[PDB]
C-alpha cells in the first residue's frame, strides 16, 4: 500500500498546486505598479557597539526600542544601551558556541543557545544583583538555531534536529513539539499576536505552525536552497524569507503562495538575516557579501545599501517603534542605522 | 545625574571583557574530526552537543573540540570553528567515507589556510589485518607489494592527494594506540603551525 500512499501524496500536491494557481488572478507587481517608489533610502550609522571580540552570531532588540542583547562566540551575551552605547550587563556563557539569543518582551529574561543543544534562560531582575541562569532547556538532540519568547513562562525553539519545540520555563519541559521539516530548522519568527509562528528549515521550505494545537497549517516552498532567515509582515498576514539561493521572497498566508521575489543579477551571496520596516514598506536583508540591502517590499526594487561592515552580516533587527535598525556582523561589531 | 555611575559600570565590565579576551587568546584551539570509532575518543582519553577537552603540555593550553555527536549537516555550523589553530583528523587503518570527509574538510572555504594533523591509528591492528587479508579490497587500484609499510605509505599518499592549497600543510603520524607520544606529536605540529601563522601575520611568509 506504500505505492498507493505515494500516489495519493503526489495527487494531493498537484491539487494544492492547482488550487494555489486558481487564486493567482494577478501579481503583486501588477497591483503596485501604479504607486510611487520610495526613492533612494540613505541610512547612516548612528552608533557602533564595540564590546565583542569574536564573530557576533545573534542580536535582539528590547520592546523598549533602547535595550538590545547580542551573542558572540567569545562566550559573552552583552546587553547594550543603544542611546548611550553603555553596556548594561555582560553574561558569561557555559558554552561559547552560541548561535541564537532572544529577549523577553517583558524585559526580565534573555534566551541563549547553540551547539550545546540547550536553550538557557537568564534572569535579568534577580534580587541578589548579578544575572544568574534561571533555567536550561534540554530536549533537543540537535543544535539550537533560534529561540523566541512568547511570555515570561513559555518560549519556542527551532533546532538542527529538524524540529521546533514549545517549552514551559517553570517545569523545563516541552509543552508541544513541531515536526514535519526534513532539514535543519534554521530560523524562526513569531506572529504579532503570538498565536502562530513560521519557521524556515534547510529543506528549502517554510511551515506555518500554531502554538495552541501544535500542528502545521501551511507549507511554503518557492526557494531553491536552505532558508536562513524568516520574518512576518507587520500585519501578520504575510512573511518574508531569506535563503542561500541569494533571493528573498514574500509569502501571503491567506493566498498560500509567494507574492514577490527580491533579487538582482550581481547578488550571489546568501541571505543571513531579514527584517521588515515598521509599516512593512521596507524589507531589509543581511548578506554574506558583507552588506545589507534595502528592498521596496511592494515594488521589489533596491532602495538603499547598508555598507559599513567588514565581515559577514550575521543578524539584523528593527526596533518596535521603527526608529532604528541594528546590524551585527562577523567583524565583531554591532552598528545602529537610521 | 546618575548616568555617570552607569558609565563607570560600563567601563568596568569593558575592562573585564578585555581581560577575558586576553586570557582566552592564549589557548590553542583544535578541531577534532574523523569518522565514527576512528580513535578520536582514544586519543582524547590518552591525554551531548559539543565536547571540549582541555589539557596543558609544555606551557601551552590546548582546547580540543569534538563534534561527532552533532548528527546534522556540518555546513550550517562548520564556520564556528574557522579560527582554530589546526584540525585533528583520525583514521582507523584497520577498517572511503574517511577519504570523502577529509576531502570535504580539506577544501572547505573556511579552512583554506588551516593545517591538518593527520593521525593513522590502529597500526598494529592494520598489520594484523594485512597479514590476514590483502589491502587491495579497500583500494581496487592499489598495485604493489602487500607489506605493511608500503600499504601504510599508500594510504598516507591517498589522504595527502586530497590537498590543493599550497598555504597549508598536513602532518601525518601513525599510532598503535599503545603509546603516550600523541601529545608530543601534536605539540611539535602546533609549534610549526604557530610559527607559520605568526610569519604570515608579519608578512614574511
Amino acid at each position, epitope marked *: 500500500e506504500l505505492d498507493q500512499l505515494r500516489q495519493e501524496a503526489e495527487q494531493l500536491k498537484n491539487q494544492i498546486r492547482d488550487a494555489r494557481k486558481a487564486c493567482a488572478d494577478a501579481t503583486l507587481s501588477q497591483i503596485t505598479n501604479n504607486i510611487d517608489p520610495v526613492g533612494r533610502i540613505q541610512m547612516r550609522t548612528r552608533r557602533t557597539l564595540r564590546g565583542h571580540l569574536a564573530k557576533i552570531y545573534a542580536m535582539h532588540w528590547g520592546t523598549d526600542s533602547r535595550l538590545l542583547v547580542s551573542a558572540s562566540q567569545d562566550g559573552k551575551l552583552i546587553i547594550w544601551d543603544s542611546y548611550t552605547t553603555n553596556k548594561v550587563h555582560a553574561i558569561p556563557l557555559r558554552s561559547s558556541w552560541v548561535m541564537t539569543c532572544a529577549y523577553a518582551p517583558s524585559g526580565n529574561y534573555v534566551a541563549c543557545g547553540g551547539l550545546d543543544n540547550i536553550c538557557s534562560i537568564y534572569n535579568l531582575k534577580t534580587r541578589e*544583583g548579578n544575572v544568574r541562569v534561571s533555567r536550561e532547556l534540554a530536549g533537543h538532540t540537535g543544535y539550537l538555531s533560534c529561540c523566541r519568547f512568547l511570555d515570561d513562562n513559555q518560549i519556542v525553539t527551532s533546532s538542527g534536529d529538524t524540529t521546533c519545540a514549545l517549552w514551559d520555563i517553570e517545569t523545563g519541559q516541552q509543552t508541544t513539539t513541531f515536526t514535519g521539516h526534513t532539514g535543519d530548522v534554521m530560523s524562526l519568527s513569531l506572529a504579532p499576536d503570538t498565536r502562530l509562528f513560521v519557521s524556515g528549515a534547510c529543506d528549502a521550505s517554510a511551515k506555518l505552525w500554531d502554538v495552541r494545537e501544535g500542528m502545521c497549517r501551511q507549507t511554503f516552498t518557492g526557494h531553491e536552497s536552505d532558508i536562513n532567515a524568516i520574518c512576518f509582515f507587520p500585519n501578520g498576514n504575510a512573511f518574508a524569507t531569506g535563503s542561500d539561493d541569494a533571493t528573498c521572497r514574500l509569502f501571503d498566508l491567506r493566498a498560500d503562495q509567494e507574492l514577490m521575489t527580491y533579487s538582482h543579477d550581481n547578488i550571489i551571496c546568501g541571505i543571513t538575516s531579514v527584517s521588515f520596516s515598521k509599516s512593512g514598506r521596507l524589507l531589509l536583508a543581511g548578506y554574506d557579501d558583507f552588506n545589507c540591502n534595502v528592498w521596496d517590499a511592494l515594488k521589489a526594487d533596491r532602495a538603499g545599501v547598508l555598507a559599513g561592515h567588514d565581515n559577514r552580516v550575521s543578524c539584523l533587527g528593527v526596533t518596535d517603534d521603527g526608529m532604528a535598525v541594528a546590524t551585527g556582523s562577523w567583524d565583531s561589531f554591532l552598528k545602529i542605522w537610521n | *545625574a546618575e548616568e555617570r555611575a552607569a558609565l563607570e559600570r560600563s567601563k568596568a565590565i569593558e575592562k573585564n571583557l578585555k581581560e577575558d579576551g586576553i586570557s582566552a587568546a592564549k589557548d590553542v584551539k583544535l578541531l577534532l574530526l574523523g569518522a565514527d570509532n576512528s580513535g578520536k575518543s582514544t586519543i582524547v582519553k590518552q591525554m551531548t552537543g559539543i565536547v571540549e577537552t582541555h589539557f596543558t603540555f609544555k606551557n601551552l593550553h590546548f582546547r580540543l573540540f569534538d563534534v561527532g555527536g552533532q548528527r546534522s549537516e556540518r555546513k550550517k555550523w562548520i564556520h564556528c570553528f574557522e579560527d582554530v589553530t589546526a584540525i585533528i583528523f583520525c583514521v582507523d587503518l584497520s577498517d572511503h567515507e574517511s577519504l570523502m570527509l577529509f576531502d570535504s574538510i580539506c577544501n572547505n572555504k573556511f579552512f583554506i589556510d588551516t593545517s591538518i594533523i593527520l593521525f593513522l591509528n590502529k597500526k598494529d591492528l592494520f598489520g594484523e589485518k594485512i597479514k590476514k587479508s590483502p589491502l587491495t579490497i579497500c583500494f581496487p587500484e592499489y598495485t604493489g607489494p602487500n607489506t605493511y609499510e608500503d600499504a601504510a605509505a599508500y594510504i598516507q599518499a591517498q589522504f595527502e592527494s586530497k590537498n590543493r592549497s599550497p598555504n597549508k600543510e598536513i602532518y601525518c603520524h601513525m599510532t598503535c594506540a599503545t603509546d603516550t607520544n600523541n601529545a608530543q606529536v601534536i605539540f611539535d605540529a602546533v609549534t610549526d603551525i604557530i610559527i607559520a601563522n605568526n610569519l604570515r601575520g608579519c608578512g614574511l611568509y
Partner: single-chain antibody, 231 residues
Framework: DVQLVESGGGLVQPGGSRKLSCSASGFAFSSFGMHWVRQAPEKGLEWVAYISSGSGTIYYADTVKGRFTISRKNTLFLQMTSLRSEDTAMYYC??????????????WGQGTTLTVSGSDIVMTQATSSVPVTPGESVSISCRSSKSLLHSNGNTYLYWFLQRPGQSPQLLIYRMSNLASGVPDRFSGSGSGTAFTLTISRLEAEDVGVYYCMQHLEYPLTFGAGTKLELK
C-alpha cells in the same frame, strides 16, 4: 536572603574616633555602590557618604568631608574621626546599584545607634504631619528648589517609607516607578519641581514617616519628613 548588618556603635567621648562596619550577605556586594545614611533621634534622614562599585568614585557630605572615610570580605566601612556632638545618629548602610532601568536605594540595613556625649538642592515638605483613617486616600507632596527633570527625560525623585521601629524602605524611585514588592496602591507623580505621593486605600501597615529624596546631583538631600499617623 539579602542582608545588611551594621555594627560598631556605642557611647563615644567627644573628639574621638570610631569605625562602623556593614557586613553584607545574600547579594553580589562587589557590583553595588554603598551609601551611609544617618538619622538623628529628633531629625530625619541625612546622606553621609557614598563609595562606588569598584571604589572608583567616593563622595562625602559637606559637614562630613575631611573627618570621615568610606572604604569597602563583602563588607563596607565608615572610619570616623574627630566626632562632634552633632554626629549622634542611627547610621544606615544602603546598596545602590546603578544602570539603565535599575532601582537604586532599594535595600537598607538595620541601623547602628551611635551616641556622642549653600548650592545644595533643597527638598522641602510643607506638611510635617497629617491625620488619616484606614481606607481613605492621602496625598503627600514635596518641592525642590531646583528642577529634578533632566535632559534625558528622567526626573530623580525618590520616596522612602519608615515605619516606627524599622529602617527606611524604598517605595518609588525616579518619581514614577514602583519598587519591587511595594503594593500597587502606592503611586508617584510630579512635574519638574512639585512632586506628590498618592496612596489609595490606606492600610495599617502604611503608617510612618515619608521621605522624598533627590538623586540629580551630589550631595543627596532628603525632605523634612511627613508623618502619617492613625486616626
Amino acid at each position: 536572603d539579602v542582608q545588611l548588618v551594621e555594627s560598631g556603635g556605642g557611647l563615644v567621648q567627644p573628639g574621638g574616633s570610631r569605625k562602623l562596619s556593614c557586613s553584607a550577605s545574600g547579594f553580589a556586594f562587589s557590583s553595588f555602590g554603598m551609601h551611609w545614611v544617618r538619622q538623628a533621634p529628633e531629625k530625619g534622614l541625612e546622606w553621609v557618604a557614598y563609595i562606588s562599585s569598584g571604589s572608583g568614585t567616593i563622595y562625602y557630605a559637606d559637614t562630613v568631608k575631611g573627618r570621615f572615610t568610606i572604604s569597602r570580605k563583602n563588607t563596607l566601612f565608615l572610619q570616623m574621626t574627630s566626632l562632634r556632638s552633632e554626629d549622634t545618629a542611627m547610621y544606615y548602610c544602603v546598596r545602590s546599584i546603578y544602570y539603565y532601568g535599575s532601582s537604586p536605594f532599594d535595600f537598607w540595613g538595620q541601623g547602628t545607634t551611635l551616641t556622642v556625649s549653600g548650592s545644595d538642592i533643597v527638598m522641602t515638605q510643607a506638611t510635617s504631619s497629617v491625620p488619616v483613617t484606614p481606607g481613605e486616600s492621602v496625598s503627600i507632596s514635596c518641592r525642590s528648589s531646583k528642577s529634578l527633570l533632566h535632559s534625558n527625560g528622567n526626573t530623580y525623585l525618590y520616596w522612602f517609607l519608615q515605619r516606627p521601629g524599622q529602617s527606611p524602605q524604598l517605595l518609588i524611585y525616579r518619581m514614577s516607578n514602583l519598587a519591587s514588592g511595594v503594593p500597587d496602591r502606592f503611586s508617584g507623580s510630579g512635574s519638574g519641581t512639585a512632586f506628590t505621593l498618592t496612596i489609595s486605600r490606606l492600610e495599617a501597615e502604611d503608617v510612618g514617616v515619608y521621605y522624598c529624596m533627590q538623586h540629580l546631583e551630589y550631595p543627596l538631600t532628603f525632605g523634612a519628613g511627613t508623618k502619617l499617623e492613625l486616626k
